[PDB]
């Protein structure tokens, strides 16, 4: 797995690969790792499929009830907090590396990392999953302050394409989502639509 999210002025971009593995068999080649927690709050999931699905279902429930009680859209920081609380409390029983990203009217576009262990930290952009090792350098060199939404999408698809190339544990299709005040725009980059970089033949 490789997952990624980027902040822009007005929203966020999230991305993931689509590979689920047992050992080195691919149990799902078109996995959807970007799961909706509310109208405009997504999590990207890495680690145990069972753990991240169960945790995401539980936070979705917690947040939905909270949101009806307050009669307001939920804060992205509140979704991240609920993830953090459950991932920290059950850190010895869970294997989950989470990125929470979305939009709310109070703080706009936000990205939070909740890595294994259950710390929480807000970031301009975040990457996670096994494949993320292979793109630290790339994203450190490419990231620019003030990127537009389209630039964030391109940056995300590039980074994931590179990770997917090298990580055996990542692969398949790239799933992207953009979240802003106006709503959620999802898409799939597959086959020739995935950014290409030559193998360096002699």
């Amino acid at each position: 797995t490789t997952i990624m999210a980027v902040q822009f002025d007005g929203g966020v971009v999230l991305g993931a690969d689509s590979r689920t593995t047992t050992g080195s068999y691919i149990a799902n080649r078109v996995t959807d790792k970007l799961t909706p927690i509310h109208d405009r709050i997504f999590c990207c999931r890495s680690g145990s499929a069972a753990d991240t699905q169960a945790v995401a279902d539980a936070v979705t429930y917690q947040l939905g009830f909270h949101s009806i009680e307050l009669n307001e859209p939920p804060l992205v920081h509140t979704a991240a907090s609920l993830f953090k609380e459950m991932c920290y409390r059950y850190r010895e029983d869970l294997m989950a590396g989470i990125i929470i990203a979305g939009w709310d009217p109070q703080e706009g576009g936000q990205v939070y990392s909740v890595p294994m262990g259950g710390m929480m930290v807000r970031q301009s952009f975040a990457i996670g999953g096994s494949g993320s090792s292979y793109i630290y350098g790339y994203v450190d060199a490419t990231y620019r302050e003030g990127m537009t939404k389209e630039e964030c999408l391109q940056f995300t698809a590039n980074a994931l394409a590179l990770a997917m190339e090298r990580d055996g544990s990542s692969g398949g299709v790239i799933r992207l989502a953009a979240i802003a005040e106006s709503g959620v725009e999802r898409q799939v980059l597959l086959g020739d639509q995935i950014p290409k970089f030559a193998v360096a033949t002699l």
Binding site: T22, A27, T31, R45, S46, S48, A50
Partner: peptide, 4 residues
């Protein structure tokens, strides 16, 4: 088991 099964991971992402």
């Amino acid at each position: 088991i099964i991971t992402x």
